[PDB]
Every structure is written in C-alpha cells, then in structure tokens.
Amino acid sequence: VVAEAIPRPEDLLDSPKFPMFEGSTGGYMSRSTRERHAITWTAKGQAKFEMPTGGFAIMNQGENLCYFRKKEQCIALGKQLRKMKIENYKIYRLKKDGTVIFMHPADGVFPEKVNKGRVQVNGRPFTIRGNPQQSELKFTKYQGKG
Amino acid sequence: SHAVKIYDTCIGCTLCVRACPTDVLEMVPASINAAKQVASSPRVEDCVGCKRCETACPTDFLSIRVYLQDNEETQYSLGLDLVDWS
Amino acid sequence: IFRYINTTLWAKAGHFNKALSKGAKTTTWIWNLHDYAHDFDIQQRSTGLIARKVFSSNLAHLSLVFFWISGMHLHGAYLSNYDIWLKDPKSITPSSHLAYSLIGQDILNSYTSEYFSGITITSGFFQLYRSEGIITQSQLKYACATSLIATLICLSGSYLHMQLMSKFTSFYKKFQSLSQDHLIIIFGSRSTSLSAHQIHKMLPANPLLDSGISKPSILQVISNSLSYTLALFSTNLSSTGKLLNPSTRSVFLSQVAAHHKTTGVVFITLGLIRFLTMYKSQFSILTSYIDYHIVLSINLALIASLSIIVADHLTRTPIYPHKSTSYPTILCLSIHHAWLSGFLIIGSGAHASIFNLLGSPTSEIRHRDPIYSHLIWVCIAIGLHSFSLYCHNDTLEALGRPEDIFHDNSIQLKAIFAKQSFLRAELQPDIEMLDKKIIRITQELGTADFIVHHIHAFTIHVTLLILSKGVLYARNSRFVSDKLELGFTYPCDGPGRGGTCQISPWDHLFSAVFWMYNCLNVVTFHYFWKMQSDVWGFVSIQKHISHYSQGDFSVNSITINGWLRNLLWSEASQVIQSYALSSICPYGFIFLIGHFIWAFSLMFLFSGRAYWQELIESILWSHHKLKIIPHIQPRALSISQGRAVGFIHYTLGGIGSTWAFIISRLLVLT
Amino acid sequence: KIAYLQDIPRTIVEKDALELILKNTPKEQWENPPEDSYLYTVKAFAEMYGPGKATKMGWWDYYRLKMDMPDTTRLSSERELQEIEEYEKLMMSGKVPFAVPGPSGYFFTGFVTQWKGKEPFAGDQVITLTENGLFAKQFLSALAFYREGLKPWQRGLEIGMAHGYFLIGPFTSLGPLRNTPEAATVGLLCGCAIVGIVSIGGLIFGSTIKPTRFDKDGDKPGAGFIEMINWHAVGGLGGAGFAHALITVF
Amino acid sequence: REAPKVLAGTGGPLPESFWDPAGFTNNKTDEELLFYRAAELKHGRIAMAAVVGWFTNASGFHYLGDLWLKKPASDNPIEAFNQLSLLGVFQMVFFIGCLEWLTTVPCPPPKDAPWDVIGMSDVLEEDTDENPMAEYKKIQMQELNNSRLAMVAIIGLIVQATTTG
Amino acid sequence: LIHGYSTLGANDLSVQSWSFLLTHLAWASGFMFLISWRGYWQELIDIILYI
Ligand code: CLA
Ligand code: CLA
Ligand code: CLA
Ligand SMILES: CC1=C(/C=C/C(C)=C/C=C/C(C)=C/C=C/C=C(C)/C=C/C=C(C)/C=C/C2=C(C)CCCC2(C)C)C(C)(C)CCC1
Ligand code: SF4
C-alpha cells in the first residue's frame, strides 16, 4: 500500500478535490489544533452526503478530499460512504510536521474482512471468567490490572 | 488509552468490528471456531470507549471486553476536538 | 373497503411495530409496546397509513374533548348549585362536583348554599355559562346533548377516515387549502358567528340579569323576544376596558360581541389578503417544513404562547361576569394556562428535535455554536445577576445592613420600561370594586417586580438553552459525530470519551421539563403572592384597602427568606391546618401526597438501572427456587424509561403540591 | 414520449395543473412517479380512465379523485422554483444570504456574505461581519494587545490605565462606604486591589503558560508577557489614581 | 457619463435616474464623486437617527435628561436641548468625536467605497447572480432614498420648530 | 428560625436562618449533578470552549 501525499490543510486552500460542502462552525478548530485527519475517496456520481461536522455536501465525480479534526469523524464519513457502495476510501492522520500516517484500511483490506498476515493482538486464550483474581496479583506487575 | 481484550469465546461475528466508530478492531485468521477467524484490537489507542463492540457481541458473555481507564485518558480516548494534545 | 377493519389484531398486541413481533420475551416488551403506541412514523406499512392514523387520532381526541365538555355540562345541569349561583353569585361558591358519603368522604363536601353541599369548583364554568346566557336547566341539558352528539360524530368520523383515506389521499398535504379554509371559515366566519350568538342571546339576556330581573319574567323576556333593547344598549360611550360593568365587574358583553365581529372581519380580510402578500422570504421555511413533526412543533409552540397570553389576559382584563371577584377561579384560570403553556412549549422543542432527526434541518444549524454559546453566556449573566440580587439582599439583611440591599427603601432598581408602560389599560387614576372585593387595581411595579421579572427571564432563557441545544445538536456534535444514526431517543453512546450520558434530544427534553417546571413555579408564586399582596382583598368604606397578604410582597419578596417565610410558610397555614375542615381536607391530603410523589421520583432520578436489574435477579432466584418462573422475564426499566418515570413523578408531585397549596388558601380566604 | 401523460382527460386533471405538476416534479420521476406523489396518482388513474378506457366513474370515486389531485394552488410556480434552485446553489457554494435575527425570526438583508473561510474545513474561519469585516479586523488589530510597533510595556500601560480608571467607579459608588464623606479613597483602594489581583493572576499565567508572542528574539521565554503584566499593574495604579483625582478635584 | 458610472443606478426617483439638475457631478473626478456619496450617506444615516431621536424625544421619552435634570424636560426637542445639563451635551459631543476618530484614522473605510464604515466589502459579494440574495443594490436604494427623505424631513422639523413652533 | 432576619430586625438566630437557606441551596444544587448526566454538559463545555 502506498500512502498518498496529503498536504497540510492550511497549505491546500482552494483545491479541486474538495467536495462542494456548505461549511459550518463544526469544522476543525484552527488556531488551537494542528493534528488533522484527512479522508480521500473516488466516487462515480455527485451524490449528496452529510458532513460529520454539520452541513451537507456533494461529492465530485472524480477524486474527493476532506479534512477533519478527529479520526472518529473520518470513520463516520467512511461508513456513510460505504453505505453508498463507495469502497477505496483511505483515511490519513496528518501530524503537525505534515507527516502522513495511513490509518483506516491499514493493510488495504477493511477490518471486517479477514486478511492474511494479521495476528490477534490483545488476545486472551480463555473465557472472560478465566482472568486471575485481582487480590492474587497485589504489588506484582499486575497490581490493579488482573 | 483503554484496554480492549478479545477472548477465545469469539466466533468471528465481525459485528464488533463493524460497530467500532474509530477502527480499533479487526478480523484475524484463527482456528478456534467454525468461522476460522477471531477479532483483534491492534489500535486501542484510538478506542474512545463507547462499548458499542460489547453491545454487538452475541456470545453468552462478551468475547470482547473493554476496560475503562480514566486516569489513563489520552486525546484520542477522550475524543478531543477543540483542543490538540500534540 | 371496511372489510379489512377486523378485530384479529386486538388480541395480537404489539402488531403495529415490527420490533415487537418477536413476542413478549421480557418485561421491556410491555414498556416498548406502550412507548411505540402513538409513534405512527415508525410503525408498519406505507406513508398513507401514517396520514390516516394521524388524522383519525386527531378526530378521536376531538371526540374525547367533546365528551369532557358534555360531562362538564351534565354536571352543571344535574349535579350543581348553578341556580342559586345565578341568583346570587357573590354569596355562593360555584360547585358542580359532589362526593359520595363513603369512608367518611362526606367530609369533603362543604357548605356552598343552604340547599347544596359539594366541592367548590374553580374551573370558571359557571361564569362561562352566565356569559353564555344559560339560565334554565333545559339549556344545560341541550348543551350536554349537543356535546354528546358531537362526541359520537367525531368518533364515527375517526372510525370512517381510517378507510375513507387511501394510498392516493392528499388533502392533508394541501397546505394552501388548509390555511385558507381554516383562516377564513373558522377564524373569520366562526368569530362572526359567535358575535351573532352574543348579539342575539347574551345582550338580550345578560343586560336583563344585570337590570336586576333575575326573574326576566321567566321565559316571557329571557326567551329572546326582546327586540326593543337595542344591541348597544349600555355601551355608555367610553372605551372598551376603560369602564367596566359596575354590576358584574367585567367588560360589557356588547363590546365583546363587537370585538368578535371585528376580529372575524379582520380574519376574513387577511384570508383575502393572503392571495397577494409578502412572501418569497419564508419560502425556504415553506418548502422545508412540510412534515408532521415540524408542523406539530410549530403548532405546539403557537398554542402554548396563546395559552400564556390567555393566562395573563384572563385575570386583569375581566371578560367574564362575576369572575374577577371569584378569586380562586381567577387564580386557577391564570395558573392552569401557565402550566399548559410551559408543557406545550416543551413539546414544541421535542418535536423540533424529532423533525431535525427525521427531516433535514435549515441554515441556522450551521452556526449553532455561536447561537447556543451566546445563549449560554446570557443565561449565565442573568442567573448570576437576577438571583444574586436576592442572595445579596438576603446576606446583607442577615448581616443587619438593610440600607445596602436592593429594595424600594434602599438601593432601588426601578422598572423603567414597565413604569413607562402605562400604555396598557391606561385606566383612570383609581380602582374598581364590586362587593367588598377588589375587581382590579393597577399593580404598582417596584424593585421586587423588577427582580422577579428578571428571574422569569433567566429561567425562560435557560429552558430555551436546553431546548435549542437539543434541537441544534441532534444530528451530530463535536462529541459524537454520528448522533443521527443513534435515532431520536437513546440513553447514551457509552461511557467512552469521558462519558456520553444524556446526549440525545430526548434527554435534552428530559432536562428541559425540569427547567420549565422550575421556570413557571416561580411564575405561579410571583402571581400568587403579588395578586394577594397588591390587588386582591377586602375594602374599607373610607377608600382604604386591606389586601389578603397585607402588602407583604414589596417588603418581603426582595429576599429568599421572604419567599420562604411569607409565602411558603405563612400562606401554607391554610393547607397544612386543613384536616377535618370540610372543604379543604382533600387539599391537605393531596399536599401530603404531592410531597410523597415528588420525593418518590428521586428514586428513579438518582439511580441507574443496573442496580435494580441485579436486585431483580436476586429476587428472581427466590422465585425460581419455588418453581415460580415468569416467562416474561423480569427486566428493570430501560434508562430512558427510568428518566421518563422520574421526570413525570417529579413534575406531578410538585404540581400537586402547589395546586393544593394555592387552592386551599384561596378557598379559605374567600 | 411518456404514455400516460398523453390525451389525459381534462376531467381527471386540467392542462395547466398537469403542466405545473410536471414542472414541479423532477424530470427523472415522470416515467415512474415514486409513491405519494401527485404524479403517482395521475399515472395510477390516467391508465384506468381515458378515451380508450373506462370513461365514467361513480360520483364518490370521482369526488375522492378530485381530492387527491392538486388544486392548482398548492404547487410552486416557476419563480418559486427558481428561488429554491438558486438558494440551494448559494448555500452549497459556501455563500449565505445574509439574515439578521429579529422578533422571533430574521430579516433577510439582501447580501451575499461569503461564508466558508480560506480553510473551508476549518470551523473557526467561517468569516462573519463582526470578526472578519474590515472595521472589525482593523479594530481588533489596533487594540493595545495587538497594535503594531508597541513595546510590551506600552501595551501593559495602556491596558492598565483603562482598567484602573474604570475599576474605581463600581466601588466608590454603590459600595459599602458609598455615603461616607470620603467614599472615594475606599473606591481607590478597592480598585487598586482589583488591579493587583488581576496582575498577580497575569503573573501566574506568564509563569505557567509562558506566552512567547511578545518576547523579542533571544530572550527568556515569557519575558514580554511578564513585562506587559507588570506595566499593566503600574497603569492600573495610575488610572485608578487619575480617576480618584478627577473625582476629588471635580 | 464615465465617472458618474461609479455611483450609477443608485439615485433618482427610479433607481437608475442620475438626477443632478445642477451639473454638480459632471467634470468631477471619480474619487470626488465617491467622496460626494460618502458625504451623502453620512448625512442621511445621521438624519435617519436624527428623525428617530426627534420623535422619541418629542413624544415624552427623555429618560436620561429627565433623570439627570430631576424634572421632565420639555417635549420640544430644541428646547429640551437647552434644559439638558451641560455635562450631558459635552459627553455627547465627545462620544461622537471618538466614533468619528475611530472610523477615520484607526479603522479607515476603503478608498474605492468610502462609505463602508462597517466594512462589508471584505465579506460581501455584491457581484453574484442569485435572486434570494445579491439584492444588495436594492437595499442600497432603500438606504439612500430613506436617508434623503430623512435629510429634508429633519430640516423641516428644525425650521418649523425654530419659526412656527 | 424564619423570623430570624426579616424586615423587622434580626435575632441571634440570623446565622441559623442564613445557613438554613444556604444549605437548602447546597442540597438543591447537587440535584443537577445527580439528575443531569455527563454528555449534555460535555457538549456544553465544548460550546463554551469554542467561545
Ligand atoms: C438550586 C440548585 C441549582 C443551581 C444553583 C443551578 C445552577 C445552574 N444551572 Mg442547574 N439544575 C438543577 C439545579 C440547580 N442548577 C437541577 C436540579 C437540574 C435538573 C437536572 C438542573 C439542570 C440544569 C441544566 C440542564 C442546565 C442548568 C444550568 C445551570 C446554570 C445556569 C444558571 C447560571 O449560570 O447561574 C449562575 C449560577 C448560580 C448558582 C447563580 C448564583 C450564583 C451565586 C449566588 C453568585 C456567586 C457566589 C459567589 C461568587 C461566592 C463565591 C464562592 C465562594 C467559594 C467564594 C447554573 C450554573 C444551565 C447551564 O449551565 O447553562 C448555562 C443548563 O444547561 N441546570
Ligand atoms: C398535540 C400534542 C402532542 C402530540 C400529537 C404528540 C405526539 C407524539 N409524541 Mg409527544 N409530546 C408532547 C405533545 C404531543 N406529542 C408534549 C407536550 C411533550 C412534552 C412533555 C411531548 C414529549 C414527547 C417525547 C419526549 C416523546 C414524544 C413522542 C411522541 C410520538 C409518540 C408518542 C407515543 O407513542 O407515546 C405514547 C403515549 C404515552 C406513553 C402516554 C403515557 C402517559 C404520560 C407519559 C404520563 C402522563 C401522566 C398523567 C398526565 C398524570 C396521571 C394522573 C395521575 C393522578 C395518576 C408522537 C408523534 C415520542 C417519540 O418517539 O416521538 C417520535 C418521544 O420520545 N413526545
Ligand atoms: C448632504 C447633502 C447631499 C449630498 C452631498 C448628496 C450627494 C449626492 N446626491 Mg443627493 N440628495 C440629498 C442630499 C445630498 N445628496 C437629498 C436631501 C435629496 C432629496 C431631495 C437627494 C436626492 C438625490 C437624487 C434624487 C439623486 C442624488 C444624487 C446624488 C449624487 C450626485 C451628486 C449630486 O447630486 O450633487 C452632490 C452635491 C450636492 C447635493 C450639494 C448639496 C446641495 C447644495 C449645497 C445646495 C442645497 C442647499 C439647499 C437648497 C438649502 C438647504 C435647505 C434645504 C433642505 C431646503 C451625490 C452622491 C444622484 C445620484 O447619485 O443618483 C445616481 C441622484 O439621482 N441625490
Ligand atoms: C457605554 C458605551 C459604550 C462603551 C464605552 C466604553 C467601553 C467606555 C470605556 C471608557 C474607558 C475605560 C475609559 C478609560 C479612560 C482611562 C484613562 C483616561 C486613564 C488615564 C490614566 C492616566 C492618565 C494615568 C497616568 C499615570 C500613570 C500612567 C502611572 C503613574 C501615575 C499617573 C497618574 C501619572 C459603547 C461604545 C459600547 C456603546 C454605548 C456607549
Ligand atoms: S462481536 Fe464478539 S463474537 Fe463476534 S467477532 Fe466480535 S468479539 Fe467475536
């Protein structure tokens, strides 16, 4: 998977990739926040949708690009797009320096679809009741984290 | 950040993955159920803690358990919008 | 067509919602069944069924209101002392409400007349009947008969329209037709009809009673046949409202008939004007607000505002004969409409939220942060200002520094615009009185009135803040970005993000009900204390006035302790010492019950459902031990239901407490 | 063309009313009107009643049909449709027809204020008249906190003079000793105390947050802010004293 | 016209009638014509407030002035000016002086539109084609036509008051 | 107790009445922390922080 070249939102004023959206006060609060999340997708028709930050929007027949403060808003918009049979949408986290981190379809396959090479992280090999008693692990590595 | 743990009782519903609003969970191959897949939480640093995954889990007691850690909150686990911690 | 009106679904409870089709597996199913009963939008079938259900349910409720009117009319004809009240209204308390002699309940009926014992009604129906020229029992009989016929007609129409309307039905969507016919034929062509009714039946009758002929030669004069009296018989020139009728202590009914005629003419002319008037600006509102919930919210807000105008206009713009002196009636007519105004305003906010979640909102939701932020600031400003003038007065009076408090005899906050608002009424420089009772004297507004009006403004603004915050933040928020998918009413989104309890618009209504209740409890208390202190009361032949509260308002209402002592304690002596006293026993008991219910609400308000679920499971263990298995599995109330029950009990108990407190005192004093 | 829209009897719906329906209804919905759309009823009936079909109806069926069709007045005209098609275009283009709240409502001022800022996705860059107008921008920029070319002590002195002069009034009047023969030295002391308290708060802010927008290059961080706060304290003393001097002399 | 085109479609009985029955604008340059409008709008805006202030004072509402003079001042606005305490008048002049200073030196209006004292030109469009907006020219007419009426109205009030009471 | 401080003078129970009212205010003030729950206020705080 190749990460795109998502530029910082303060340096990409008036881009052709921006969908026609009404614009509201719900957008990311500049002058106080420098971490922005960007979601890009390619659509087939200019179908109206709803921005996660209030107000509606119309996609572009080609590429689309939106900027949001939180990853949750990008994921909400991604679910909304996927309901409209729009796959191939990618969500990036932009660092303050401009570093682009590729986040949502991390390995290129959506998390609800099994993909080889993944390993069960935070897996516990027993029923939930199999966890040790908190009283047993006092003042050990797992003092209050049985 | 919270602590989202997946237990062996998982039956590969994928409902927990679909219900997560911040892409914390994912499906990994396994061999402990007829679905040949179990959930995983590789990105719990983005877990807000909404516990929708627990609502969606149909096992007798949740195969996915979210442990809230309030003295641990980060900007991602709090869903901060007006304020950046980076 | 009607062959599909079958009883086969009566036994099948929960048929209307497809979420209840799985059967009553748990007790939550029962509450959901009751919750979705009137939610026609989410119920099964197409949109035409929604229209049929809405219209037929409106007709059924109209039949219910007609049945209630018929019951009041029959009580007045056959269970009342309306005869002696007609003969002498200033010495007989209205009563169309008896109590059976069971369990000693006989102690509730009290002496209203030498031949009648019963519960003093404060609905004002007797004054309405007298203003409606109703003198004989036959007239009330036929009023009750017509109301029963209307009940049957509306019930049959509600039954019919469930099948007369079809998938092609569209008459409800024709908003131009609805507005035009409503406006003209009802507000114009029925207002003039009532003007005709008054000109031809009141002026022939009410002047005859005021002329001292309560005899009216029985039917020889009362039964019309009085075309030698002239329509404007006793207008006495002057201006409508400047000079009241000295006998009945009200505006002359000829002026009321002229008012109705002119208002009907005005409404007809406005209907004609609407063919070409100002438009193309409310047009976005015109196209975007064609939906059930939005029009419901608009109508609820409008009707509630009209209710509060009625509450303020029924008391010191006396229209009804012998009603200004009937102080309990005046108090009830003000306060009941005040409460209805508050409740219907809250409902308007709720349905605005519902419309936002179902339909698509308008432009004002995009700068919602400045709106609901300056609202926050104004609420904080007028809360930290209005209330604290009370806290400042209280603290400095406790410290013994009365010259530093906000009073008339101290630093005084003059009500500048109200004192310069002599425009309203503009009556002559004196008072009006009928019989030992004050009809109306101008409320001299001072510092205390200024402070309490600012308290009213603050409470109104906070309730509006809650309502508008629920409405504007319904679809999404910086906190949760997919609130639209969560629906209209939900407990929360989870303990994450610090905690997301009560983000739904339903929970915003839940808080707004508390704040509206707190808002107009102060309105009720302000009215109840101000009228007693400064308007109502006895008289002295030397033109001196002895009010009921002896002018406590201007000297005590400047401090919270004054409200506690001179209103909630001294004026509660009537209700608290009301045991074994014939008329006011139920009011003392209902005072106690209102306290009990209000405190009972706190169990639902303060607790969560998980504790109750665990307790229910512990009890279910004992039930399963003895082979007593409820297959409708016992589940604790849902979070939203717990909040709803708590709010309902809270408001009901508090309203009952005030209700008893005001009514018992006014019945004792009168 | 579309089959059911041809030769439709005038009795079913009039010609002008049908044209108004077709104009109001979007073009793509003519072939298969959706449902609950007047055009759906027109199709469902014109395919049953017409020249080659059932030419008569029962009086009640025709009465119900006449109450399902539009009554020629509930349909938007061409100018209203233009109003909507252009209002929505403005709203989606990021421009707002400027309106001002009034007595439970708003008056349209007939102005197109471009709404979305330079960063269209930024929530705080939506430009409004009171913050992004020429007068608002030049007023905010010319404040003592923002004025170009002012040394930090000058900003502090100006702000302090304003605060100290204003703060005397609330105490010397309507104060605990408002009626005493002095009644103003008490107000002077209280105003100086308020100035000192807010200056201490500013020192806390500058020693904890340490704003660096007033520091000159190569200086101890927050030194400019601390200098501004100290000179605000000095200016507050001066303004309070000047207000007291004016009150006593005049 | 050439230069009077910068203030075109903004006066006359009907909106597009350059009245000028004295040649006061011909031969004058574009900046002078813009400055002439800046004088017109400023006079009219003050005249509108002057007429409103005259009527709220000639009806009996002079609170600040009844509460400062400790007596109801005369309804006649010209005579009420004399009764108004000299401290009040001097503060009134100073407040307008601060406003006139504020608009001119610190927050100057542009030189192409010297009447934009609030400065809408940086957020306004004024050149789009929407109907439910872009009626800014019409609201310019209503400001000018109302203000021009207020100018002759307030002079009539002062002239009649100072002569025929 | 209620007669402690009034528009007739004060007693040595003035502190008692003032503390009575203050404790009523404290008791009622905790109702909102018990009835109204977090999310409403979190949105309110987000709006204030926006300001
Ligand atoms: C008596 C109890 C009480 C009190 C005092 C408040 C107070 C408040 N509520 Mg609240 N509320 C309550 C009960 C109460 N609530 C209950 C039972 C519910 C039911 C759920 C709610 C539900 C509710 C909602 C849903 C909302 C509020 C809001 C508000 C705020 C708006 C009013 C305001 O800013 O005035 C100022 C606050 C005061 C207490 C006024 C008095 C201030 C004192 C007297 C002056 C200062 C004292 C002085 C500085 C002493 C210093 C302290 C000392 C240590 C030195 C305010 C903080 C609204 C809000 O926050 O919006 C802005 C809002 O949205 N409340
Ligand atoms: C014209 C008035 C009107 C109409 C037509 C509606 C219609 C509707 N409302 Mg609504 N509402 C109104 C006024 C109205 N409301 C007002 C004034 C308020 C403010 C309190 C609300 C608050 C409100 C909320 C919060 C909700 C609705 C909902 C709904 C929908 C479903 C209602 C349902 O199934 O409940 C079924 C009916 C009941 C459960 C009635 C139970 C009785 C009540 C709750 C207690 C009353 C106690 C009683 C007065 C005292 C008892 C006496 C005592 C001595 C024993 C429906 C569209 C719900 C919805 O989902 O909308 C889509 C919803 O969540 N409304
Ligand atoms: C301060 C006064 C003033 C000023 C500077 C302007 C300026 C302007 N007006 Mg104008 N106007 C005014 C008052 C003013 N107006 C009033 C009160 C009316 C109502 C009758 C009008 C009606 C009006 C129309 C109908 C039109 C203009 C137009 C114009 C523009 C073209 C230049 C012009 O006409 O001569 C500018 C120079 C002057 C006006 C000189 C001022 C008058 C001199 C000093 C003599 C007047 C003295 C007077 C007779 C005695 C005073 C008392 C009097 C009330 C009886 C220009 C921007 C035209 C325009 O822009 O349309 C595109 C246009 O068509 N004006
Ligand atoms: C009401 C009004 C308003 C407002 C206003 C204001 C805001 C005002 C302010 C004012 C002010 C706020 C003023 C102030 C002033 C100040 C001063 C004038 C000061 C001075 C000072 C001094 C001079 C000092 C000196 C000194 C020093 C510095 C130090 C040393 C000592 C000495 C003393 C030397 C508005 C417009 C909104 C509108 C309407 C009207
Ligand atoms: S919902 Fe539960 S059982 Fe299903 S895949 Fe997720 S963790 Fe496993």
CSV table of C-alpha atoms in Angstrom, one decimal, chain C residues 533-670:
chain,number,residue,atom,x,y,z
C,533,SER,CA,-50.5,41.4,48.4
C,534,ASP,CA,-51.2,44.2,45.9
C,535,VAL,CA,-54.5,43.5,44.1
C,536,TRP,CA,-56.9,41.1,45.7
C,537,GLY,CA,-58.5,41.7,49.1
C,538,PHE,CA,-61.2,43.5,51.2
C,539,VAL,CA,-62.0,47.2,51.3
C,540,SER,CA,-62.9,49.9,53.7
C,541,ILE,CA,-65.7,52.4,53.2
C,542,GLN,CA,-63.1,55.2,53.7
C,543,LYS,CA,-61.4,54.2,50.4
C,544,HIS,CA,-58.7,52.2,52.3
C,545,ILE,CA,-57.7,48.8,51.1
C,546,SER,CA,-56.9,45.7,53.2
C,547,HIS,CA,-55.4,43.1,50.9
C,548,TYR,CA,-55.1,39.4,51.8
C,549,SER,CA,-51.3,39.4,52.3
C,550,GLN,CA,-51.3,43.0,53.7
C,551,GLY,CA,-48.7,44.2,51.3
C,552,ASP,CA,-46.0,41.6,52.1
C,553,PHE,CA,-44.6,41.5,48.5
C,554,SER,CA,-42.9,44.8,48.3
C,555,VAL,CA,-41.2,44.3,51.7
C,556,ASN,CA,-40.5,40.5,51.9
C,557,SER,CA,-40.1,39.3,48.3
C,558,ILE,CA,-36.7,41.1,48.0
C,559,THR,CA,-35.1,38.2,49.9
C,560,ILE,CA,-35.3,34.4,49.5
C,561,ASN,CA,-36.1,34.2,53.2
C,562,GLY,CA,-39.1,36.4,52.5
C,563,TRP,CA,-40.3,33.9,49.9
C,564,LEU,CA,-39.7,31.0,52.4
C,565,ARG,CA,-41.5,32.7,55.3
C,566,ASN,CA,-44.3,34.9,54.0
C,567,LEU,CA,-45.2,32.7,51.0
C,568,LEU,CA,-44.3,29.0,51.6
C,569,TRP,CA,-44.8,29.0,55.3
C,570,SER,CA,-47.3,31.7,56.4
C,571,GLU,CA,-49.5,31.3,53.4
C,572,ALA,CA,-49.3,27.5,53.7
C,573,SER,CA,-51.1,27.6,57.1
C,574,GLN,CA,-54.4,27.1,55.3
C,575,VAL,CA,-53.4,23.9,53.6
C,576,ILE,CA,-51.3,22.5,56.5
C,577,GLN,CA,-54.1,23.1,59.1
C,578,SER,CA,-56.8,21.6,56.7
C,579,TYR,CA,-57.6,18.3,58.5
C,580,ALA,CA,-61.2,17.8,59.5
C,581,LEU,CA,-62.1,21.1,57.8
C,582,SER,CA,-65.0,20.3,55.5
C,583,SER,CA,-64.0,22.0,52.2
C,584,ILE,CA,-60.2,21.6,52.4
C,585,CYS,CA,-59.5,18.1,53.7
C,586,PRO,CA,-58.6,16.8,50.2
C,587,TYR,CA,-56.3,19.7,49.6
C,588,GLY,CA,-54.3,18.9,52.8
C,589,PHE,CA,-54.2,15.2,51.9
C,590,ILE,CA,-53.2,16.0,48.3
C,591,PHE,CA,-50.4,18.3,49.6
C,592,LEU,CA,-49.1,15.3,51.6
C,593,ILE,CA,-49.4,13.0,48.5
C,594,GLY,CA,-47.7,15.5,46.3
C,595,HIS,CA,-44.8,15.6,48.7
C,596,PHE,CA,-44.7,11.8,48.7
C,597,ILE,CA,-44.8,11.5,44.9
C,598,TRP,CA,-42.2,14.2,44.4
C,599,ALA,CA,-39.8,12.5,46.8
C,600,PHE,CA,-40.6,9.2,45.2
C,601,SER,CA,-39.5,10.4,41.8
C,602,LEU,CA,-36.0,10.8,43.2
C,603,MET,CA,-35.5,7.1,43.4
C,604,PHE,CA,-35.8,6.9,39.6
C,605,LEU,CA,-34.0,10.2,39.0
C,606,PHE,CA,-30.9,9.4,41.1
C,607,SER,CA,-30.4,5.7,40.4
C,608,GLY,CA,-29.3,3.6,37.4
C,609,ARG,CA,-31.0,0.6,36.1
C,610,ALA,CA,-28.1,-1.9,36.6
C,611,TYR,CA,-28.6,-1.9,40.4
C,612,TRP,CA,-32.3,-2.6,40.0
C,613,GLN,CA,-31.6,-5.3,37.4
C,614,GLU,CA,-29.2,-7.1,39.8
C,615,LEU,CA,-31.8,-6.8,42.6
C,616,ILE,CA,-34.5,-8.2,40.3
C,617,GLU,CA,-32.1,-11.1,39.5
C,618,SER,CA,-31.6,-11.8,43.2
C,619,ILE,CA,-35.4,-11.8,43.7
C,620,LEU,CA,-35.8,-14.0,40.6
C,621,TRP,CA,-33.5,-16.5,42.3
C,622,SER,CA,-36.1,-16.9,45.1
C,623,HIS,CA,-38.9,-17.1,42.5
C,624,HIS,CA,-37.1,-19.9,40.6
C,625,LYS,CA,-36.4,-21.7,43.9
C,626,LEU,CA,-40.2,-22.3,44.4
C,627,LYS,CA,-40.8,-23.2,40.8
C,628,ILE,CA,-42.4,-19.8,40.1
C,629,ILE,CA,-40.8,-18.9,36.7
C,630,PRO,CA,-42.2,-15.7,34.9
C,631,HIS,CA,-41.6,-16.5,31.3
C,632,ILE,CA,-42.0,-12.8,30.5
C,633,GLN,CA,-38.6,-12.3,32.0
C,634,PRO,CA,-38.4,-9.5,34.6
C,635,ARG,CA,-36.1,-6.7,33.4
C,636,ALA,CA,-35.6,-3.4,35.1
C,637,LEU,CA,-36.8,-0.3,33.4
C,638,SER,CA,-34.7,1.0,30.5
C,639,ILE,CA,-32.5,4.0,31.1
C,640,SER,CA,-34.8,6.3,29.1
C,641,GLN,CA,-37.8,4.9,30.8
C,642,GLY,CA,-36.3,5.4,34.2
C,643,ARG,CA,-35.6,9.0,33.4
C,644,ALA,CA,-39.1,9.5,32.0
C,645,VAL,CA,-40.8,8.0,35.1
C,646,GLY,CA,-38.6,10.1,37.3
C,647,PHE,CA,-39.5,13.3,35.4
C,648,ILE,CA,-43.2,12.5,35.3
C,649,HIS,CA,-43.4,11.8,39.1
C,650,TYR,CA,-41.3,14.8,39.9
C,651,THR,CA,-43.4,17.3,37.9
C,652,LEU,CA,-46.7,15.6,39.0
C,653,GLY,CA,-45.8,15.7,42.7
C,654,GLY,CA,-44.6,19.3,42.6
C,655,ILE,CA,-47.6,20.5,40.6
C,656,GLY,CA,-49.9,18.7,43.1
C,657,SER,CA,-48.1,20.4,46.0
C,658,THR,CA,-48.5,23.8,44.5
C,659,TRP,CA,-52.0,23.0,43.4
C,660,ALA,CA,-53.2,22.1,46.9
C,661,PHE,CA,-51.2,25.0,48.5
C,662,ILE,CA,-52.8,27.7,46.3
C,663,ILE,CA,-56.3,26.3,46.1
C,664,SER,CA,-56.9,25.5,49.7
C,665,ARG,CA,-55.6,29.0,50.8
C,666,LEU,CA,-57.8,30.8,48.2
C,667,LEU,CA,-60.8,28.7,49.2
C,668,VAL,CA,-60.3,29.5,52.9
C,669,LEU,CA,-59.7,33.2,52.3
C,670,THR,CA,-62.7,33.6,50.0
